């Protein structure tokens, strides 16, 4: 109906509507936020030892803290 | 090719501002403002200097004096030096060299300030690990935290569009 | 107002680890793994008390840990570490994906012998 | 060694432009049924050398201008832009590694708009002013669109550094994640260099001509760099230099070949065309290239 | 045919070949077989400055490999 | 009239732009961070007149942090006295790498 | 004190006097207003670069874009003045007298 | 000042070219003005838009997506407004 | 490691500069010898005219403005 | 003009003034003043005469150099103790430039030359909205930035504003120039008490905005630009005459009438400070700025000028002009004498 008169307008509105709506439905924006968060620009500053913390491991080989393992599995 | 090069570019900057504050023909004024903006770009790139002077170079020296010369072309003609313009240029150069001499061979010349007279390598960082050329991530933060600011900025520019078409005979 | 209290040159003379910087980058991961354990004490000293001229003794201690680490990596395997850092060296800014197979060779060396 | 680099970059541009004149005349000649220039020497190379030196010999029309210093000041600006504007474009290792160079590209194109305006003012009477004013308008009509498309095509690349571009175009060419954006970009490069199908209908015509054809070679070099390029092996970069020069040659031939066979546009048709056809579509491609990398979970590793 | 436009194309391509080969040759020649180090960020600049300081010759490309551990 | 819609609706639309020592995007400090923290905590809940005439010590300390006025004055006096005694010619100086 | 600030403020005051006194055309006056604009741009930008005041670096680009659209409104008014007269002179405005 | 050295060499060699090229041989329309301020205001909004690829790396992405789409959508509103109100026609 | 090297280097420049001050200004009246201008006795980072001052050209031009117009 | 476009531009004027009010950042104050300018320019040139063209040109140049001098003062404020807080300043020079920029922006006797010229060649709706909002918006800023001002600035500007807004007005017979001179005099009154107790200044702002709304509403009810037209509107309607009487004398400020309360309370909290010769000089000039009101009254309602016919014709047709809100603002503008303790409604 309008596809014959101004076709570049209709194509622009279609791709604009998907560029607005399409970021809602996603299994990937959570991955976007995780990858964008997990990049250390600054130095990871240590902390004073004992406020009686049964967490936060001392050797960086110890997997007690939250590591990243979804990276190497894409 | 020496240490006081930001100072020298500041002096050529004041030279340009005097050179079109002498009120020439407006195409000579636009030429002088392009020269002044180029050396101001040189100054701000010499203070390091990543993005902002290359940003003003597109806007004023990329899309504002173009429109000024465009409007000088369409509106005025200036169809064919004078003692007034040349006298103001000589008095401006006199003020320039007077301030430069009385600062360089002294401590300070003050309007109301305390200007320590030496080269401006001071002050600067002591070679710290900046790693992102601070202004870059600064203006990168203009979108995350800048909620209200870009909203009122875009709304002001949209209203500027409707203002220009109405004044230039809306619709 | 008041005078500054700056320390002496005889305390401010420790031999640096005068390696170049590209090899220092090329050996950085195992420098952070085995050593750099007592320098988080140094860095916590620095961030709590923001006074260099107060936490410099731990600077001496990280200097000697780095020097001992470089002694240990020099006298044992690898000599292919030399080929590895000159492989990572001249490739502009250092991407680790530039020289990967000799990184694997040096890793197999240090894994097997040490 | 630095001024030696300067001489090896800015001396061969004159040879490049004059041999581009013979290349485009021979290409138009074989698009037609023409040979020539081939009578003057072997295949016509000293014939562009000869007409360049003739036009330097041939006596100028005496001015008959106004503001002789401004008549000096415009073509010197055009040719010094054409000289200064091959610096960060990487033939394999570029002249100055910059944090940002593509905004510098667009700003120098805006300075070329200034030079066209100043030549049109300082040239002659009213009709030359009106024609050059419309030419400045149809040159300034596209630094919206080309800069917008540049922003969209390197939003997939994070940084302005252009060496991250020459890295991250290794797997597939960037012509494939944006073909219509690149095609509209190439139309805007025809608009920046101002050839047919974009109309035109004085002195020095040699320097005007020089600035235009160096602008053409510059925009096609930046076309080849911006969109494609094969793998760069260090300690043998002559491979990348050869492949770069070959694809820039092919795209320059295609550029002149698109000039060769189409009529010029009506001026109001040109403005109507640009605004009401390219500009909503460039915005739509911008917003879709904004919304895509948050959906592919791949923002570029902006160092 | 187009067999004779290819001399003009070849000569103009050689005139486009010289700045790439010359630039890469001078970059590999100005640091003794090394590459000219880039510095976009101040971290790499401080690393390059301590690199040119430790080598003793006040030129960064030499870079004092492993012969001064102890 | 300075209204308080800013505090009543609660959304801090502007308080991040306002001072230094806010949440920078990469957590880097300014040049005079600690001086600002001490001056702001000195003049926080104070009636802006005895805040003017009691925190003046740290205020002038912060001003000469931010501009480094007397510090450059002392450095210029050092270089002028160095210049007049090198014009005198006593002890051609080994402050430049030498002894 | 960073002595460059003295000459930049002096150049500001020179641009301000050039904005105020003008005899022939309004275009040169608006252009010196643009120069005064650029002066404030440059001074604030040099300060924000020197002090490492890194978060609120919105100022140079936002002052730029806003006072540029101010100049756009000024160009529209000057085109209207040149429309309603033969020229755009400072004179021929002797209607609407105080 | 090394790119200033390149700038000086380009400018001086170009002046050598010009001086050898010279000393060896010896009303208006309203519709022009709409395009000027149209370019000016849209180029200012481009000046707003162009630091977007600096900004993609942050931990608050939803607001940046929303306001970036708001800025381009406003630019589209301005273009469609002058399109519907016969702004650039002949 | 770089932080420790930088700390030792800047304390070295501070000790050198204060010894050179205490030699060179022994004739002017007044002049307390090494008092920091600030009131609060805290370690402050100096203004890069106290680290790289009185060096005459080479190291200061490669230090403050070296990276700014290096490439 | 389109009504959608006009309602949107009114919304932008509202938005700019609220951004001037609420924002603790200096940049947003400057943006609010600028957006106020950019929106208020097409409120003028609502017609297409060159009168509005020259008026908006003069207004734009003075308005723009005021905005840029304000930005100069703010960048000097950050040259000194550097933060974007609306507070006490840190410079007599920056405060000096800021008060001069807000005096250019506001309307004040060394910088008042644009006001009668810009009000001569504009429609009355545009004049009403520019007077109300452009005398409203900088007063919030001055109310904020009071504690760091040299009083010589404000007081010389105030005294000179009251005496020049008085001495202009005796010779001008245009209604708009009379209202503009009255505006300069009342802004001098509202500037004078700023460093003493600004509750008086904002209450006087409320009163003067109500008075200006009543005045330009009573001149919207009949397309009149000269006093001869006011005599013809005496002939065609009698209630307009007695309202011109009461409202013009309320501009005059007599004690049974509501315009005396802003003068009297100012003299109260001005003379609890021990300056006395300055109150009596200001109030003698308040006696001075009443004569042009009085001859305006004598033209309209208390003498009877000869009238042209076709008012014979006009008597058939009703007074079918719409009034925005006339009677509420009228009796609020005149009968607000015995509500003296509504001073405390403000702070
Ligand atoms: C005639 C003007 C009368 C003004 C009101 C009466 C008055 O106080 O006059 C004295 C006033 C000034 O006197 P005064 O009111 O300042 O009286 C001294 C009061 N102490 C000690 C608190 C300062 O005279 C004039 O203003 C001169 C006329
Ligand atoms: C021109 C231009 O933009 O040059 C950029 C250059 C700095 O390079 P940039 O990409 O900003 O990277 C930061 C440090 N290299 O900027 C510079 O090298 C500054 C040069 C300043 C002197 C010349 C000024 C000419 C005007």
Residue numbers in the entry:
A (entry chain A3): 10 to 83
B (entry chain D6): 1 to 80, 85 to 175
C (entry chain A8): 1 to 114
D (entry chain D1): 1 to 201, 217 to 318
E (entry chain A1): 1 to 70
F (entry chain S5): 1 to 99
G (entry chain 4L): 1 to 98
H (entry chain D3): 1 to 26, 50 to 113
What's the paper's own text on this?
The ETC is composed of four large membrane protein complexes: (1) a H+-pumping NADH-coenzyme Q (CoQ; ubiquinone) oxidoreductase (complex [C]I), (2) a succinate-CoQ oxidoreductase (CII), (3) an obligatorily dimeric H+-pumping CoQH2 (reduced CoQ; ubiquinol)-cytochrome c (cyt c) oxidoreductase (CIII2; cytochrome bc1 complex), and (4) a H+-pumping cyt c oxidase (CIV) responsible for O2 reduction. CI is an ∼1 MDa membrane protein complex with 45 protein subunits arranged into two “arms”: a peripheral arm that extends into the mitochondrial matrix and a membrane arm that is embedded in the IMM (Hirst, 2013, Sazanov, 2015). In mammalian heart mitochondria, the majority of CI is found in association with CIII2 and CIV (SC I+III2+IV; respirasome) or in association with CIII2 alone (SC I+III2). Here, we report the isolation of functional SC I+III2 from ovine heart mitochondria.
Although we were able to separate three distinct CI open states using the standard 3D classification, we reasoned that because of the systematic worsening map quality along the peripheral arm of CI, averaging of particles with diverse angles between the membrane and peripheral arms was still occurring. Hence, we developed a strategy for the separation of different CI states on the basis of the angle between the peripheral and membrane arms. The focus-revert-classify strategy resulted in the separation of nine distinct structural classes of CI ranging in resolution from 4.1 to 7.5 Å. Of these, seven correspond to distinct open states in which the Q-site loops are disordered, one to a closed state in which the loops around the Q site are well ordered and the final class to a closed-like state at 7.0 Å, precluding the assignment of any of the active site loops. All six CI open state structures at ≤6.5 Å each had distinct angles between the peripheral and membrane arms. Whereas in the closed state, ND6 TMH3 was a clear α-helix (residues Leu52–Met74), in each of the open states, the helix was interrupted by a π-bulge midway across the membrane (residues Tyr60–Met65). Given that our preparation was largely in the active state, but many SC particles were in open states, it is likely that CI undergoes conversion between open and closed states while active as part of its catalytic cycle.
